[PDB]
Design an enzyme around this catalytic site. Structure first.
Site, PDB file in Angstrom:
ATOM      1  N   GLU A 134      -9.270  -4.574  -4.363  1.00 27.83           N
ATOM      2  CA  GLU A 134      -9.645  -4.459  -5.860  1.00 27.83           C
ATOM      3  C   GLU A 134      -8.554  -4.053  -6.769  1.00 27.83           C
ATOM      4  OE1 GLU A 134     -13.920  -4.885  -7.616  1.00 27.83           O
ATOM      5  OE2 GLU A 134     -12.043  -6.032  -7.483  1.00 27.83           O
ATOM      6  N   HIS A 186     -11.468  -8.098  -9.714  1.00 29.71           N
ATOM      7  CA  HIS A 186     -12.818  -9.022  -9.928  1.00 29.71           C
ATOM      8  C   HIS A 186     -12.650  -9.017 -11.498  1.00 29.71           C
ATOM      9  CE1 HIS A 186     -15.258  -5.326 -10.569  1.00 29.71           C
ATOM     10  NE2 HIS A 186     -15.770  -6.043 -11.663  1.00 29.71           N
ATOM     11  N   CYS A 222     -14.742  -1.815 -15.926  1.00 31.60           N
ATOM     12  CA  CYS A 222     -13.923  -2.036 -14.865  1.00 31.60           C
ATOM     13  C   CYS A 222     -12.508  -2.190 -15.404  1.00 31.60           C
ATOM     14  CB  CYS A 222     -14.690  -3.102 -13.836  1.00 31.60           C
ATOM     15  SG  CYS A 222     -15.840  -2.536 -13.128  1.00 31.60           S
TER      16      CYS A 222
END
Ligand SMILES: O=C(NCCc1ccc(F)cc1)c1ccco1
EC number: 3.6.1.15
Lengths: 172, 171
Positions: free
Chosen positions: A54, A30, A139
């Protein structure tokens, strides 16, 4: 954590990614810019992209980081392993956040469906917020640990719960 | 505008800005030869020592960017604190510590008095960022209570290769 692990941590899209070797770069799916057609001067046509939810791995046809040695990448780690999450913050501050890893898990976080290796922070209680916990900008940061004489990378940061105590590592 | 900006290199270790005028540290890290600290002559600094806990009160605002925080004499037994370690590498190492009783302990041959604690990062580490070193003394112990950060002492001692730490407390 060793300087040669911090040197692999690269600002990328809305977060970070990590050079496993001169040709291999890992990240959280993402954070990748969806319109992007060129990475580190190379067209898409010259890159092998391996995506599992992911977890995304990029393998380049030329050495992008020839300063690096290749290291071990594993599919998560044993329950009870303590990892460091190698997080960079505002001003060359380096935050190796300690985390106790647990089972592979499927969860719902801020309404999104997330799958990876669960863990719990070892930084404090009630860790919500930037001083002791994770933020969305973290992230893609790598999960690493020391096994005998060497270091292992075993995934990338994908999510954290609203409380902030639980994190999820996306795995190959 | 972060807790971390309050953690400052000082003497042979570190200390912590509670407010624009109040700085706390571990007694043994303070220089024994000095005419000023932070640009203020020692003549204008109030020094309050209790064992391994020292509080400095300055005559003017040294850190006017900060608000004043809650400082307490240790914390309830069983509180999980964070010790806010800075390293000369540039790393920030917050470590969870389960706090216990007020006690006198023989930590590597030395009697030290303060609030005992046990590190929560596990067995040891094969040289991971999971424990304290002697250079860390003066790092603050903090915890979140309601919407407020509480500071309840400073890092005074640790057992080498062990689990036990001592947080020196006010009064
Ligand atoms: O480990 C943690 N908490 C548990 C403390 C504890 C309470 C009671 C026990 F019996 C055994 C351990 C932790 C790390 C960061 C925030 O929380």
């Amino acid at each position: 954590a060793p300087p040669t692990l911090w040197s692999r941590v690269t600002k990328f899209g809305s977060g970070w990614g990590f050079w496993v070797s001169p040709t291999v770069f890992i990240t959280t799916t993402h954070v990748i810019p969806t319109s992007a057609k060129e990475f580190f001067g190379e067209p898409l046509t010259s890159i092998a992209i391996h995506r599992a939810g992911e977890f995304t791995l990029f393998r380049f046809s030329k050495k992008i980081r020839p300063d690096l040695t290749g290291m071990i990448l594993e599919e998560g780690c044993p329950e009870g392993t303590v990892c460091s999450v190698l997080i960079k913050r505002d001003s060359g501050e380096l935050l190796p956040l300690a985390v106790r890893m647990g089972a592979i898990a499927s969860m719902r976080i801020q309404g999104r469906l997330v799958h990876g290796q669960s863990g719990m922070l070892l930084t404090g209680a009630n860790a919500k917020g930037m001083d002791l916990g994770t933020i969305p900008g973290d992230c893609g940061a790598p999960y690493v640990y020391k096994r005998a004489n060497d270091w292992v990378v075993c995934g990338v940061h994908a999510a954290a719960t609203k409380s902030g105590n639980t994190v999820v590592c996306a795995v190959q």
